[PDB]
Design a protein around this ligand. Sequence first.
Ligand SMILES: Nc1ncnc2c1ncn2[C@@H]1O[C@H](COP(=O)(O)OP(=O)(O)O)[C@@H](O)[C@H]1O
Ligand SMILES: CS(=O)(=O)Nc1cc(Br)cc(NC(=O)c2cc(-c3ccccc3)cs2)c1
Ligand SMILES: [Cl-]
Ligand SMILES: [Cl-]
Ligand SMILES: [Mg+2]
Length: 860
Amino acid sequence: EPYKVNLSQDLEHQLQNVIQELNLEIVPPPEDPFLPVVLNLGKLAHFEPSQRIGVVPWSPPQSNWNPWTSSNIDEGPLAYATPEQISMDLKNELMYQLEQDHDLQAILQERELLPVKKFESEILEAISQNSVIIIRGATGCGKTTQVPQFILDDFIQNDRAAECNIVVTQPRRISAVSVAERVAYERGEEPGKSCGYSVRFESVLPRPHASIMFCTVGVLLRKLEAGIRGISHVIVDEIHERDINTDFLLVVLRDVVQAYPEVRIVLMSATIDTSMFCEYFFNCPIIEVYGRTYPVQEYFLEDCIQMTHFVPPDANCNLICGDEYGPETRMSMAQLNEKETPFELIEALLKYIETLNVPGAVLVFLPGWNLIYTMQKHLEMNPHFGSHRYQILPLHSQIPREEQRKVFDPVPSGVTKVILSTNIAETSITINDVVYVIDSCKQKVKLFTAHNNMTNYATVWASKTNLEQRKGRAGRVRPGFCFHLCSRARFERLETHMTPEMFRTPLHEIALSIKLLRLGGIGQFLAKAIEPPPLDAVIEAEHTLRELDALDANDELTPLGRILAKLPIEPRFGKMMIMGCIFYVGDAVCTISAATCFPEPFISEGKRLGYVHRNFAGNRFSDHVALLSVFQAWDDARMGGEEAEIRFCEHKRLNMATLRMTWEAKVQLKEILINSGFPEDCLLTQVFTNTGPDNNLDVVISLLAFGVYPNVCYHKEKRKILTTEGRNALIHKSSVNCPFSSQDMKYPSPFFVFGEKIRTRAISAKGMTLVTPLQLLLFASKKVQSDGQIVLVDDWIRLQISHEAAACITALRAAMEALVVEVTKQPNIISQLDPVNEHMLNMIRQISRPSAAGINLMID
Ligand SMILES: Nc1ncnc2c1ncn2[C@@H]1O[C@H](COP(=O)(O)OP(=O)(O)O)[C@@H](O)[C@H]1O
Ligand SMILES: CS(=O)(=O)Nc1cc(Br)cc(NC(=O)c2cc(-c3ccccc3)cs2)c1
Ligand SMILES: [Cl-]
Ligand SMILES: [Cl-]
Ligand SMILES: [Mg+2]
């Protein structure tokens, strides 16, 4: 039914007077109430379109240049020091370290036994003679940790240390950091000397000479605006993962290596068909790397049920079982849901592994942290799996690096190490005690569908290549056992390979990177990829960027697009942050934005929020206000020094690591807006109240509606909400807006904007913030139609509201867009806006108020 909006007569008129002063078109009302007219003003201001394939330039290392900071070395000995001097000094330093440090000699002795060591000479010849090589070999040979070292030490030992600066790309944040720490440790160092790392919002720079930067590809791409300056070698690691940014970088690097053949590219791959990569890079050589494998006995779901005598409480391949297996096996398998992972069978399998009386670690492949937590809980219930007999360790990207390194530690005699792992343990790391693999046969992939703005953290079937790779992890120390939890018939219906990310990932961020780097057309450049993305993804990226006014009608980068290109967040949040700067609430909007890059700081364990966490929300029915209020309290507690911070965080059940990384990310976002010319004064920390009148916070909530659009919903009763699609959905358990018990919430408005629309067995809105009907019209709606008493918003909900208010508010939206265009041309103008534009912003400030829509959040 149409929702009744109670806005005052004075507000009606003030809106009309601002639209008067903007000399703007109040789209008049229809004659026939069944001829509904579109209120949506077209664009009221544009960027002067520009005229319409570039190569990223390359230059080699040189002694007076810091390639990591992209700046001349002017202070210190290294400003004038000769390459010969630098090389002699680094060589002398290294030989002396090696002859003095006994713990270091011992570590080198371990290095010299890695399978890859035998191929050191062959690898180094191939690189010295070819612009591009591929190093191919089984996971655990030592490609990742040793090859960057082999190259550096080659230069150091041959008196040319100064001529060597290596970029190593990794498809994951966790790999870039872990490998940097591991390689530093192998060289008797911490990151910051010969090794360093750069990931989104965190870096430890290496020394400028004879050094290795481990990064994520996203970092190297954002740093390319000035070219690859002072680097001898780009090692692209784990190319077989088909991480989308790695696929993208291979396009860039192939044009680099064609134009600048003195550069060295080294691609490194697990044992897959690398023909594609070889052919792509002008039939470059492939260096085979190998060492001792062992046979691994493979079993499937039928073999597992039979040999454990286990009994449980697309077509279904658990009803298919051959006649060489007994009837209780078939009857038991046929009771298992293929969409579930049988946690109880995994327990039974661990117990069967005991009876073999061959000691070794068990690696369990589980798709996400949810099934690792679920497995871990289930085990730590049964006292059989206590400290006396078992060390059960989780391995996922989000647990702290102290805990992640424990998977490599050895375990007391008579205790069995069990690793409950994501696919990090498939090809990117090697745990050395492993004799037994239990394989869920599933992957976790983020699927996004634009048409309905639906996110699905999907549990999908692994590939045969994934099952073969997972089986290989059992056969590094002795003959091993791999227990696949899929039926033999399910295995026959598995794809050979996962879909590459390039085929199933939104491309608007890569599109911005192509345009910032002057590489040509989005379509044109992506057509040269090794396996190009689907057309509809390209069209969808171009549509997103034009709608944001990041591209002009000639598909060229606007001054707005150039700032969004530089901000390492979702473009829509980038634009939200520019709007925050204009309203002088930049700090708060940079915090909302930074927080989307990290897990929730609330340690809530998948249950409904308790009293302490709900309290951070005040009277705003907003997960985002809760998050801003946590940061304000945390930042106050931190005045008391580290231990006061630790105590505040564990007394409030907060993840301190997440609050610190989010804070660092906010500081970096603010720096980029500063260097784009936004004044310091629009980005200051602003104390606020989450209970009393606060116009700064009202504007932040208006801008959050813009940021998360089109995620709007309407509350019916209890946890039931109506989505943009006219569809029924649930309030996420996580939300301060989820009813703790049977007490139903009394929302002063039924409208919510939210961070994520999530598909599981149902549709969920996670990260929910109540907005007024005025904020809906202003920033949480594209198309609005009026019959003259009733408005239809994006074809999914109706408001009973003045035709004049609705059209006046839609015009404010259009007026606000035009100012954003003008502000991005010259950001310092926000200091000194002409009066009509201040009145426009004051009107948005006013209709952001709860009072503006007849709401008082202090009276329930
Ligand atoms: N943090 C660590 N602790 C212990 N061993 C490690 C660690 N990191 C790597 N290794 C060991 O180094 C060896 C080489 O690993 P890596 O270079 O990743 O191989 P590849 O890249 O060829 O798969 C393996 O035996 C692995 O177990
Ligand atoms: C473009 S290139 O390939 O020639 N070099 C290159 C390659 C890669 Br991967 C990363 C980086 N730099 C960084 O990641 C960072 C630099 C800083 C910084 C700190 C203080 C002052 C100035 C810069 C912080 S992170 C550089
Ligand atoms: Cl191996
Ligand atoms: Cl493929
Ligand atoms: Mg590797």
